[PDB]
């Protein structure tokens, strides 16, 4: 049972620049002191990435502003989130996000992650509902509150769970019937923007889902310190968490491989003529 959290349909989203982000290891082979050109669905450098702010707005403005819209899935998506206290918990992928078609539910409680692809009738605004108490000063159990019915399940998988301080990055891609997740976790300290630096994502898992994926919706966990059984959707607060979504595109990259096998730099071969000439000349310095 879910009671609609917000009446406001949408707010005008504002975008930031994804400077040199979202680079993932293309293959599982080791290379040292090697400049390597690889074609895949990479995220374009210096792209436009939608910035979502699920935070409590000031009391003068309307009491609710947190947003979890159903966003398109276009040949894979890039997802990041700068947060503390694990506000973001899981995502939901599927075509219609309703009962007639199958959809992928990937939700992660701090101790564990559940990945089920089953026909799900979803709530408009799904949220994991945590509660907190004042006398004990401890945080308590949660309520799932994400789907009304689950039927014809075909795959279950359970594994170890996968200012601002935490910067988590994920890349989702569905190719040839498999759903692949690339991840990276990095402590950071710039509060409101994507860091200016290079980070390489590592292959977490690839799944044999075989489902059509057209749209995805993020799952946020909400906290209220009082519970009554007959009245809900009143008193929920989003804390302070921000997530970012970008879209992948078929592009060619040239990668710098370090002595210890890490990816330290990469070049977008379609940014400008200078980047193209670097990509063709296989050198990061052009004379």
């Amino acid at each position: 049972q879910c009671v609609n959290l917000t009446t406001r349909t949408q707010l005008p989203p504002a975008y930031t620049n994804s400077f040199t982000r979202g680079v993932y290891y293309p293959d599982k082979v080791f290379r040292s002191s090697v400049l390597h050109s690889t074609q895949d669905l990479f995220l374009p450098f210096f792209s436009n990435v939608t910035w979502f702010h699920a935070i409590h707005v000031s009391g003068t403005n309307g009491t609710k502003r947190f947003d979890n819209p159903v966003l398109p899935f276009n040949d894979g998506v890039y997802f990041a989130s700068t947060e503390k206290s694990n506000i973001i918990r899981g995502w939901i992928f599927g075509t219609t996000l309703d009962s007639k078609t199958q959809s992928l539910l990937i939700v992660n409680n701090a101790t564990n992650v559940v990945i089920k692809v089953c026909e799900f009738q979803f709530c408009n605004d799904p949220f994991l509902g945590v509660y907190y108490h004042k006398n004990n000063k401890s945080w308590m159990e949660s309520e799932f509150r994400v789907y009304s019915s689950a039927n014809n399940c075909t795959f279950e998988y359970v594994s170890q769970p996968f200012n601002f301080k935490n910067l988590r990055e994920f890349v989702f891609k569905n190719i040839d019937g498999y759903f692949k997740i690339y991840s990276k976790h990095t402590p950071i300290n710039l509060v409101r923007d994507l860091p200016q630096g290079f980070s390489a994502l590592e292959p977490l898992v690839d799944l044999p889902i075989g489902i059509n994926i057209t749209r995805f919706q993020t799952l946020l966990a909400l906290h209220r310190s009082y519970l009554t059984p007959g009245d809900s959707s009143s008193g929920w607060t989003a804390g302070a968490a921000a997530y970012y979504v970008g879209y992948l595109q078929p592009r060619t990259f040239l990668l710098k491989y370090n002595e210890n096998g890490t990816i330290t730099d990469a070049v977008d071969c379609a940014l400008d003529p200078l980047s193209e000439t670097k990509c063709t000349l296989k050198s990061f310095t052009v004379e």
Partner: antibody
Amino acid sequence: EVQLQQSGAELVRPGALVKLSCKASGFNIKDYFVHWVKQRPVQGLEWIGWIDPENGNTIYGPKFQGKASLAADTSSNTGYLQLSSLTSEDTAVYYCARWDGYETLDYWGQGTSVTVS
Amino acid sequence: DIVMSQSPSSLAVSVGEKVTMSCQSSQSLLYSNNEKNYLAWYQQKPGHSPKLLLYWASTRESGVPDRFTGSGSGTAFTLTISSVKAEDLAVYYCQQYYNYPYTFGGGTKLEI
């Protein structure tokens, strides 16, 4: 033991607001929630609602939703209730209560009784 | 909103007699997620501020041991005394905690 200190009996004119004070010892109002109560021998006792000192907001009941206001300040261990203007319905006994999260009301003061000329 | 009814209105029994009071509700009190019944019982004397008796049917709290024993259902709720005691002149109420407002029953009185 927890005990509460409450406004004494009041005799007032209609057509004007009224203020009440509910006091606590042994804890901070932030630690709990605060309910208010008005009681009538005939027509029974009524339930007003709860105010959260930590939130800075308050959720009221629907019968009392009109002609009621709740305020709190942590500086003193005191919570306050006020009404827009005194009607015959408001000419009643009044009580304040403390409500634990995920739980019942646990503390009730001596009370306050409003009689009107 | 939830409405509460109480019975008996008033009953007179000798000290040591067994007495039972029952209050009935028009809606269910059971909450599936916790499987917990959000109901309490109160006892009050004239001119004494109402004080909570232990909720969730676990009526046992500090005081004289097992003063009053209670039983409840999804829609029905009863309180029992195995032997009426002279000191315990009491008036009782039934309240619910399922939705606003927390209902107050019609009241029950016990006379000796």
